[PDB]
Design an enzyme around this catalytic site. Structure first.
Site, short mmCIF file in Angstrom:
data_model
loop_
_atom_site.label_atom_id
_atom_site.label_comp_id
_atom_site.label_asym_id
_atom_site.label_seq_id
_atom_site.Cartn_x
_atom_site.Cartn_y
_atom_site.Cartn_z
N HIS A 264 41.86 40.76 30.74
CA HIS A 264 41.27 39.78 31.63
C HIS A 264 40.37 38.84 30.83
O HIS A 264 40.03 39.09 29.67
CB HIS A 264 40.46 40.47 32.73
CG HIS A 264 41.30 41.21 33.72
ND1 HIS A 264 40.80 41.67 34.92
CD2 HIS A 264 42.61 41.55 33.71
CE1 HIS A 264 41.76 42.28 35.60
NE2 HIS A 264 42.87 42.22 34.88
N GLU B 67 37.21 38.20 31.02
CA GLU B 67 35.96 38.81 30.57
C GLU B 67 36.21 39.83 29.47
O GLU B 67 35.41 39.95 28.53
CB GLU B 67 35.24 39.44 31.75
CG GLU B 67 34.97 38.49 32.91
CD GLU B 67 36.08 38.48 33.95
OE1 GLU B 67 35.78 38.74 35.14
OE2 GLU B 67 37.25 38.22 33.59
N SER C 114 34.86 35.25 39.75
CA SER C 114 34.08 36.44 40.03
C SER C 114 34.80 37.69 39.50
O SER C 114 36.02 37.81 39.65
CB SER C 114 33.84 36.58 41.54
OG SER C 114 32.88 37.59 41.81
N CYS D 95 36.46 41.32 38.62
CA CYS D 95 37.04 42.49 39.26
C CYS D 95 36.21 43.73 38.94
O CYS D 95 35.19 43.67 38.24
CB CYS D 95 38.49 42.67 38.82
SG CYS D 95 38.66 43.36 37.15
N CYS E 132 36.08 44.44 35.00
CA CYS E 132 35.19 43.55 34.26
C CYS E 132 33.74 43.74 34.68
O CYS E 132 32.83 43.58 33.86
CB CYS E 132 35.63 42.10 34.44
SG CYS E 132 37.30 41.79 33.81
ZN LIG Z 1 38.76 41.63 35.54
#
Ligand SMILES: [Zn+2]
Ligand SMILES: [Zn+2]
Lengths: 152, 152
Positions: free
Chosen positions: A57, A59, A84, A86, A89
């Site tokens: 991802h 992040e 935003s 998950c 992350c």
């Molecule tokens: Zn994530």
């Protein structure tokens, strides 16, 4: 203020999202900034399609590109993300003790992690960045199968 | 029963941890198993030292090695890990909807994620595997700088 570098952080995060979009991936970008001087410790974007990755991802790719840092360094940083986070992350922010997370937009996606971060003692700032909302709205519109087979 | 494949899963997870030890890394391993037939979707171990990775924990490396799976597939799996998960690996289990997590031991390490998994509706089973406890106890004793500069 804690927000001195927030425009710089979200601008880099959006650049990463736009770069990943041009590469054919999901337009989610991020960066990690030292709160003391605004230096950039790392930056990255979602690599699901660029590398066939289930875990990279935006992040996670950002933290991976920072390398193995000293624990004390993380404690005075801000993680910037265009979307935003998950639950995974969110957990990465908690595990490294990153005290601040600045989020571009939580309209296109939101998990319970945004609230969980505050429960665990972290500061969360949602800036409602129109550039981030537009680029993710386009991805969801143009690639709904890719999105809903993923975090959508 | 739900625990039909638990000895197979933890044996694969321990083999991954032992393999990571021979490579010079942290002895934390895992695998993801389909609850229906016991097939192994993926396996992996901690790659902090093998790849200089800040994010490739044992559970993350396991999910990465599985590849991009269909969302429905995750919903009937068990994630096996030799060590109780940190907040990031806890979040990864939650994000993918993996309903069951079986843990080798939580003596050497434990985070708030073990309880958070149950709060979020996941099943957590701690087997207290003596092989896992021994190999991580040895790592912490022999490499305290590497351990305490990380999640230790
Ligand atoms: Zn994530
Ligand atoms: Zn972990």
């Amino acid at each position: 203020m804690a927000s001195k570098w927030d425009q710089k952080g979200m601008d880099i995060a959006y650049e990463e999202a736009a770069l990943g979009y041009k590469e054919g991936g999901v337009p989610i970008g991020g960066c990690l900034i030292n709160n003391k001087d605004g230096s950039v410790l790392g930056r990255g974007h979602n690599m699901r399609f660029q590398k066939g990755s289930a875990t990279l991802h935006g992040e996670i790719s950002t933290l991976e590109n920072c390398g193995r840092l000293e624990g004390k360094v993380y404690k005075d940083t801000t993680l910037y993300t265009t979307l935003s986070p998950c639950d995974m992350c969110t957990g990465a922010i908690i595990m490294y003790g990153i005290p601040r997370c600045v989020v571009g937009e939580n309209v296109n996606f939101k998990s319970k992690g945004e609230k969980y971060l505050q429960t665990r003692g972290h500061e969360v700032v949602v800036v409602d960045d129109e550039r981030c909302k537009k680029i993710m709205k386009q991805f969801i519109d143009e690639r709904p199968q890719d999105w809903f087979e993923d975090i959508g």
